[PDB]
């Protein structure tokens, strides 16, 4: 995360860390959506050009970790199975950059571990509007090094026409961009390592946090004129339901 701040303890209890089992290596962010289902970006697990084509046994996930070992707070889980979106377009623009990982053992919720909510239709309509701000969190790059504390930044959702104009990459209805415009006064953006990390919004209908996006791509980090892109979670929920309800 670029130009953000340290997270407060318990601020993002749904935060999940995806690690490469051996050699131990942090790969991406992810988020807890239940006691046994975790969301992340497909490119975090499948992206041939970078030699990424992981098997479930290739990784592990860490939950409730405040630093880069809290013996009694954080949880370390193995994966039962990975599910990458069938129409994930990795060769072109990263269309439908989403994936689900099912843990071998459900995890017990706590003060430091709890699931983020997945948007319903009216929550999304109302919250997904240009100018409204959301929150990105991650253990990724601080600049185009890495933090020892989970980072956070709030960024405004940008109008589709403007997102399109910011980049030559072909953007889809399955993505959205969020960030400040150079004339806006504030900065911030996700960066390498942050993929899979949640972009959340708090709903006044019920004071609950909802994950509206997944950190997917960008060009450079916190560059003036550029805006980070996120996987449009809601438009892909039916796939989520299909998978989960097997």
């Amino acid at each position: 995360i670029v130009e953000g701040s340290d997270a407060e303890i318990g601020m993002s209890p749904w935060q999940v860390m995806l690690f490469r089992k051996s050699p131990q290596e942090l790969l991406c962010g992810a988020s807890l959506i239940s006691d046994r289902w975790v969301l992340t970006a497909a490119h975090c697990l499948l992206y041939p050009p970078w030699d990424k084509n992981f098997t479930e046994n290739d990784l592990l996930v860490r939950i409730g970790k405040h630093s880069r070992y809290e013996r009694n707070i954080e949880k370390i889980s193995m994966l039962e199975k990975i599910y990458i979106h069938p129409r994930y377009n990795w060769r072109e623009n990263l269309d439908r950059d989403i994936a689900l990982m099912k843990l071998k053992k459900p995890v017990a919720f706590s003060d430091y571990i709890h699931p983020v909510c997945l948007p319903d239709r009216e929550t999304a309509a109302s919250l997904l509007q240009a100018g409204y701000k959301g929150r990105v969190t991650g253990w990724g790059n601080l600049k185009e090094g890495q933090p020892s504390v989970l980072q956070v930044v709030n960024l405004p959702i940008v109008e589709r026409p403007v997102c399109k104009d910011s980049t030559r990459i072909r953007i889809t209805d399955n993505m959205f961009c969020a960030g400040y415009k150079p004339d806006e006064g504030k900065r911030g953006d996700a960066c390498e390592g942050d993929s899979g990390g949640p972009f959340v919004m708090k709903s006044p209908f019920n004071n609950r946090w909802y994950q509206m996006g997944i950190v997917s791509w960008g060009e450079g980090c916190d560059r003036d004129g550029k805006i980070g892109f996120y996987t449009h979670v809601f438009r892909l929920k039916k796939w989520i339901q299909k998978v989960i309800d097997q």
Partner: peptide, 26 residues
């Protein structure tokens, strides 16, 4: 439906240091 309610914040009726920025944007 036990989701999106942080034990150390929502549950203790405490607000984090920046969540008001989100409310302001609405």
């Amino acid at each position: 439906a036990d989701c999106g309610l942080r034990p150390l914040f929502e549950k203790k009726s405490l607000e984090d240091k920046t969540e008001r920025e989100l409310l302001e944007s609405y």
